[PDB]
Write a protein that binds this ligand. Structure first.
Ligand SMILES: CP(=O)(O)OC[C@H]1O[C@@H](n2cnc3c(N)ncnc32)[C@H](O)[C@@H]1O
Ligand SMILES: N[C@@H](CCCC[NH3+])C(=O)O
Ligand SMILES: N[C@@H](CCCC[NH3+])C(=O)O
Ligand SMILES: [Mg+2]
Ligand SMILES: [Mg+2]
Lengths: 30, 499, 501
């Protein structure tokens, strides 16, 4: 097996991109 | 009558614009995908109607069915799924508007639907509209249920044929899997020129093009190989590129003028290392995408027999010269004699005796290629490494460390077709320049398949290319085997077509 | 001297082959990367020597220094890091082999080293070799401590000598990988569409032409994938993207190369308002992820000029093109629409003359407007700024604005006075699109060699119904320039196109 080389992403954690978001809604009490 | 349909619908849509009814509205606020709608509400009982939930969906009408005067069903499709729209006038915003929209809509139209989840008494999940909006009319009669039309109007193929989308999802999954595999091994994804002063790295007839401000011809690349090796001289030990290559040649079941390959180069690896990495990558890719190592394939299409192709590692290996001697039933010359005219004549006689055709020029490399295609490649059903090609057919591959006249090369064949080519890289600049000079002498003599000499590449090797192994894979051919396609046009969104 | 160096070293390496010493061995088994070696053994104290640990590493010799007759130091480099080789005669396999290997090696050679971790009394982490193997000699004098043209014509020398160069190409790869993760996570399908077309489309550019021999027809290298992507949305693939090469047959300058990389994506049921929000989230998130913050230093005129901090903190500023241009000019503009009209064109021509804004022929309404926007609006766009609502005459594939007559639902994102994104609600009415194509065909015959060809195949696809859709394109090379503090596009292309020497 070939020698280990760390990924260029750093190797810490998988990339988790920030995504667009939507403010939640609460139901009409009436 | 399709022509009459288009004239009539076009006039009707033009009338809607005149009347200010906006048949191409700018924005419709889709709330939920059809897929999520089906998942969220499949649990409903027949007859249910969730009057408190309202949602907006959109898609293309594939069917329209009236049921009495106050009820109409639309088969709404998108994302590879379908949802019934059950439009009854009792739930619509108003009876006058209900009549008006239903008279407007036709099969093929894109629509937005605002309404409630429900289930019919017969148990079909439905959305019950308060309002339907025409988003984009279809001016033509949508077809229902040759191959040229599917490839010349791929959007019609996608609308009609659910399997087509799935093939291109699989193709994308293959490429994304390969990037993940190599990124995890510490490779850097790079981009190298697609326009070159000297095409190289493969045997191919190139496209030529003129750059005006520079007043000089450029060639579209046939492979990125020589640039990647210069980057390894530059100290980037592991590089890869998934990108387009170009060949100015013929079109058939396994060739298109533009096609996609992955090449990678790995410092301090040899071709033994690359066989193990190939086995791990290819078997892991098949299992991840299909769920098992065994894939069904119809080499002759659905009209013929199918075979399970077994990708369980290790793959079979055969050595080209030894296996050819078995297939021919005769001893071939010693491999250190493969550069002689005596060996060329022996191969020429064998091709004549076996009725293996080889058009001129009848060079040793071309006669060997024809013999290998006839006698070895046809036995490679399951993934099979063909190894240790003669140097005379591998001008960029390093000489074999123990077999004189051979190289450290392999090709991976599946179902009789090449999917990978790889070798320990030739990194001795004197020997590489000598092989290029032989190529250039053959090119000047009339052999169009010979490579151009690349002086800048040979100079780069003079600065020291570490021992290295490189690899290329034809992505389209891999997508063919993983989609049960025997025609490359099935895995190209817009294949090149005779006009 | 460098010519003499090469002849002498080539002759020495040839003699190694004759003597059976194999100067290009097939395989050396590296145990550990230089980066991992440093991380594992940086903890050693000065004077440490781990005689029980034997490792194999490899790299390129960047310096060779003899210290008396029994000690030689090699500066071994790889992966952007360095490791001293402290070769002591007493720790080598034998004194005779020690003399032999040291007389063989030169600066620039690729070597493999088998030895123990150690640290000198001066505190320098080292490997102490039992055996060194020549893996690939450098036949030339390797340069030291360059000139811009040589750096681009021999990029491998630039990568060997200048650590900052590798870092720029790592950043470029991170940009692309970030964009794919963002679009994949939003449900987009990554697609590949033809790079050779009978009719180039989707942008304003002069194409490359090439000939296909079997089909006996000319083909054009693509200038944009845009029309293919919209046909796939007609086909029901709601979200598609492609990061790939485009081609323009023009001149070379600080922001222009004949081939370059873009990302385009198309999103059914979005409009350009949705795409501004997505652009702000993608670009700000990418900048913070790659650089660690929203603020980036940039030298628009290179290191000899002033630098500015560019602030990517969202939301980005928005300006409307025509109304902001009218404020910068101090005067109202004539209204434009789909048709070129000489009265309006003359007024804009007069404005450019009075303001000394150059416009080479043809001085069309769209080109004169573009030059005015470049002089008065783009120059104010230091932080990322959306310029919005372009006139229809500038935007033949953009949908008409739903509330502003004669404008379109378009934006461009400018950073440091340069365009990085172009996007719009897509025109999806086939009759209107055919009409705009007919206007482009007229302007081509009148002298505009960048004007679009009519594409009847694409108009036919629109007749089957393209859903309301918004699409977007980003110049990847320009983004890479801003995130690597490069003001020359050649800094972010591994092998930039170069005039023949
Ligand atoms: C069969 P053979 O004579 O050995 O040629 C090997 C070459 O075929 C290339 N190639 C790969 N896939 C291709 C496809 N679909 N259409 C056309 N060419 C394709 C591949 O880069 C390699 O350089
Ligand atoms: N450039 C080769 C693939 C890589 C071979 C190993 N350096 C080809 O076109 O087949
Ligand atoms: N094709 C455009 C980018 C996409 C515009 C939105 N459809 C360009 O070259 O600038
Ligand atoms: Mg082959
Ligand atoms: Mg622009």
């Amino acid at each position: 097996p070939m020698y280990q080389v760390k990924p260029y992403h750093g190797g810490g954690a998988p990339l988790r991109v920030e995504l667009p978001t939507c403010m939640y809604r609460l139901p009409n009490v009436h | 009558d399709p022509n009459q349909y288009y004239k009539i619908r076009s006039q009707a849509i033009h009338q809607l614009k005149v009347n200010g009814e906006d048949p191409y509205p700018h924005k419709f606020h889709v709330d939920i995908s059809l897929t999520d709608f089906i998942q969220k509400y499949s649990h409903l009982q027949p007859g249910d109607h969730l009057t408190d939930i309202t949602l907006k969906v959109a898609g293309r009408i594939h069917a329209k069915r009236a049921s009495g005067g106050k009820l109409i069903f639309y088969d709404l499709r998108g994302e590879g799924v379908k949802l019934q729209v059950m439009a009854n006038s009792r739930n619509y915003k108003s009876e006058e508007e209900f009549i008006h929209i239903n008279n407007k809509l036709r099969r093929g139209d894109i629509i937005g639907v605002q309404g409630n989840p429900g289930k019919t008494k017969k148990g079909e999940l439905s959305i019950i509209p308060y309002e339907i909006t025409l988003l984009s009319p279809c001016l033509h009669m949508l077809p229902h249920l040759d191959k040229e039309t599917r490839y010349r109007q791929r959007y019609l193929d996608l609308i009609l044929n659910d399997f087509v989308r799935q093939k291109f999802i699989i193709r994308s999954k293959i490429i994304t899997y390969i990037r993940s595999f190599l990124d995890e091994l510490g490779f850097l994804e790079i981009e190298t020129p697609m326009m070159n002063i000297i095409p190289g790295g493969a045997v191919a007839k190139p496209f030529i093009t003129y750059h005006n401000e520079l007043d000089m011809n450029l060639y579209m690349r046939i492979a990125p190989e020589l640039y990647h090796k210069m980057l390894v001289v530059g100290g980037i030990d592991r590089v890869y590129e998934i990108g387009r290559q170009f060949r100015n040649e013929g079109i058939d079941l396994t060739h298109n003028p533009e096609f996609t390959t992955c090449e990678f180069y790995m410092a301090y690896a040899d071709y033994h290392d690359l066989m193990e990495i190939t086995e791990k990558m290819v078997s892991g890719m098949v299992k991840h995408i299909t769920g098992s190592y065994k894939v069904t394939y119809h080499p002759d299409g659905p009209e013929g027999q199918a075979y399970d192709v077994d990708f369980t590692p290790p793959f079979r290996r055969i050595n080209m010269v030894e296996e050819l001697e078995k297939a021919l039933g005769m001893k071939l010359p010693e491999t250190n004699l493969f550069e002689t005219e005596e060996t060329r004549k022996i191969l020429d006689d064998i091709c004549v005796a076996k009725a293996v055709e080889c058009p001129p020029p009848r060079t040793t490399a071309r006669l060997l290629d024809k013999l290998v295609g006839e006698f070895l490649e046809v036995t490679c059903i399951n993934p099979t490494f063909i190894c240790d090609h003669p140097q005379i057919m591998s001008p960029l591959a390093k000489w074999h460390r123990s077999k004189e006249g051979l190289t450290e090369r392999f090709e991976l064949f599946v179902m009789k077709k090449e999917i990978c080519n790889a070798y320990t890289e030739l990194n001795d600049p004197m020997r590489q320049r000598q092989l290029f000079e032989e190529q250039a002498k053959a090119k000047a003599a009339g052999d169009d398949e010979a490579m151009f000499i690349d002086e800048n590449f040979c100079t780069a090797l003079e600065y020291g290319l570490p021992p290295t192994a490189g690899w290329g894979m034809g992505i389209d051919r891999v997508a063919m085997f993983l989609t049960d396609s025997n025609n490359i046009k099935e895995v190209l969104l817009f294949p090149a077509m005779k006009p």
